[PDB]
Design a binder for this molecule. Structure first.
Ligand SMILES: Nc1nc2c(ncn2[C@@H]2O[C@H](COP(=O)(O)OP(=O)(O)O)[C@@H](O)[C@H]2O)c(=O)[nH]1
Ligand SMILES: [Mg+2]
Length: 207
């Protein structure tokens, strides 16, 4: 049975890399800030355990401000690629580096996916290696970043961390932690995916 994940967040936080970590393959292209920004979603899939994992990597364009002709059609494409709705939105942020631009990117997520999207969101912190083997929960307990605390609260405290450069059993271990977070979220939601008005329209147009 399908597990559908949509990656969201500020550009450069490591979301394409996180997609690669989850799928254990080079599904999405990571890039430096100097490189061209993306305008189209990319979709890839793989297996974890007995389950098909399907991931949509949202374009950098979804974080842009002001008028953008391509946005509406590509948001429609994102919905069509994730229908009947994502099980999880993974809001990707770099550990210790949550800024006003992250806050704004999170607002774009609510605009695109709806006010209630945080109820199916997990906050994924990249650069886990910066913890030096320390507890993520303890780090977040002591974090003084007020905007980050508010986001994490809106996401029901659901958090996880990746070192996207991890390999081997270290990679397996961090992906397992994310799957454990997803298991608990889905349990709370009786296995349901996120939905909204627009996802409903799509679902009701198919036989
Ligand atoms: N050290 C480190 N670098 C990372 C990590 N995740 C991503 N990167 C790097 O951060 C840069 C941006 O990553 P990318 O996947 O393109 O982020 P995106 O813009 O959110 O899709 C790339 O140079 C990645 O190699 C991480 O966990 N640790
Ligand atoms: Mg990317």
């Amino acid at each position: 049975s399908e597990l559908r994940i949509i990656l969201v967040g500020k550009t450069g936080t490591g979301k394409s890399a996180a997609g690669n970590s989850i799928l254990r393959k080079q599904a999405f292209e990571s890039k430096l800030g100097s490189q061209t920004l993306t305008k189209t979603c990319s979709k890839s899939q793989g297996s974890w355990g007995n389950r098909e994992i399907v991931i949509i990597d949202t374009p950098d364009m979804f974080s842009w401000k002001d008028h953008c002709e391509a946005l509406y059609k590509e948001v429609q494409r994102c919905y069509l690629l994730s229908a009947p709705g994502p099980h999880v939105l993974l809001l990707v942020t770099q550990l210790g580096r949550y800024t006003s631009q992250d806050q704004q990117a999170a607002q774009r997520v609510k605009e695109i996916f709806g006010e209630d999207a945080m109820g199916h969101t997990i906050v994924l912190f990249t650069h886990k290696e910066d913890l030096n083997g320390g507890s993520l929960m303890d780090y977040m307990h002591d974090s003084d970043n007020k905007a980050l605390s508010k986001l994490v609260a809106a996401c029901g405290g659901r958090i996880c961390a990746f070192n996207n450069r991890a390999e081997g059993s270290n990679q397996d271990d961090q992906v397992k932690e994310l799957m454990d977070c997803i298991e608990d979220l889905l349990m709370e939601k009786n296995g349901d995916h996120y939905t909204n008005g627009l996802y409903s329209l799509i679902q009701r147009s198919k036989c």
